[model samples]
Target: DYTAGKEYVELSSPVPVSQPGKIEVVELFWYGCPHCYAFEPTIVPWSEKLPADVHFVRLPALFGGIWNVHGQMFLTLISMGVEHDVHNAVFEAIHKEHKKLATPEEMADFLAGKGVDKEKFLSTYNSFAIKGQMEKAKKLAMAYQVTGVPTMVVNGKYRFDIGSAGGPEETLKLADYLIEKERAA
Candidate 1:
């Protein structure tokens, strides 16, 4: 029943969650994506409101060569154990501050200015684990047939596009509908 541009289909090889009991809600996004940036404020609150049974996750998209820098930045912060704190900061830096963090060095500089440890950032950015994650992100984007950022996938079976959702707030409302529908099923 899954249909591209309609229902969501599985993207990427299935990366099973550590906890099997939780229902996964994945948001596929890119830091440099303006839409994704705009969606953040709504998403943060929506995530907090999610029922304990649902686990909300964010996957940074790594597609074209241009997105590599932002993707790498995500991996770097994640590997360095700073993603939770710096994820929004990165988005704000690009979308709000008008900072150009389009490369590894530039990203590092931005993080450094934010008081992140430079050596730790660099070390983790180049770590094999981060590289592996980047590869996984690329494959997932292709699997989802993603053409844009800020896409939401529920149970890896239904995708709701922001445009279709009527905007960020409504997009989340649609997600809530889908989540309940799926749970009932």
Candidate 2:
């Protein structure tokens, strides 16, 4: 049953959506999480087909340590407009290839092999812009009380996860249910 406080949780105080006049769905994820890697295939297709009024975005959970490091790599690639280019490769490197990629140099080296400019990657990885973005990601995670990766926030008012929703497919169904609920209100 997709019941409140069980399948999903309503935020005591809603987090503000960045894109106004649209329903915002944020997927909070971590690069190193096996579950997150598993969720990607299910989510990517669904996200691509989102309706005109629904805005979907993925925010990396910067819980510090290697999480923070990989998050920095993600944001840097996003800034360089190459995140889409290497998103899956990053996942494969960690979860499948068993690569470390836990430091700036290692990340840069790995990305370089993928054709990204090594120097550019490091410079952007250390930029104040990316630092601010990390701060924002951190704040959003705290605001949502996200305890794990692959948590979904719908319209910034409700949150749920795969376990809460019963399974991967069920999670998206729950998201659709919540989106329609928000649309009706």
Candidate 3:
């Protein structure tokens, strides 16, 4: 049994899935989270191999202060359509190189190598659109009752984390179980 409240918790009021008529999996994470960085190796591959009916997306967790800055940078890159290109680089810069990409200028400087225009990155980073995106992300996190990075919400109904599911690989395995459960339901 992927037992309730043990491996995962079922939401009382299910959070709406982004894609209708498909099993949507949302992974809430923060760039500065070491555990999230560690889970990357397992999650990335599992996500890549998800069945056609499953949809996966990453929602950057924004808890204010440096998180807000990083979240803003993430959303900005997403808006400019370069998030996929520079996502891992941002993670490596923080975890491996130990760079504190905690400011607009610093983030822009890093993204410059990825073909992002500094001025445009700065403008988008500070734009109302990015602010709106941040709000949406914050609301989604709250809806999921997310307390930490690396938490996965399956179909916006079941929520769990690597620790709860026992390990990184097990977490995705549990996700497959949940997906099959959802599919059969």
Q: TM-score for every candidate vs. truth?
A: 0.86, 0.96, 0.96
Model 1 stretches astray by more than 4 angstroms: 1-19
Model 3 residue 182 lDDT score: 94
Ordered by lDDT, highest first, the candidates read: 2, 3, 1
Please say which candidate is ahead in TM-score: 1 or 2: 2
Q: TM-score for model 1? A: 0.86
What are the clashing pairs of model 2?
Answer: none
- RMSD in Å for model 1: 3.1
Tally clashes: model 1. 2
Q: After superposition, how far is residue 125 of candidate 1 from its true place, in Å?
A: 0.7
In model 3, what is the error at residue 77, expressed in angstroms?
Answer: 1.0
lDDT of 3 at 46: 84
Task: Give the per-residue lDDT digits (tens) of candidate 1, residues 1-185.
Answer: 22355534444454554246766788988888898888888999889999998989888777777687778888778777778888878888888898878777787788887778988888888889888888888876676667778898777666677776667887788778777766785
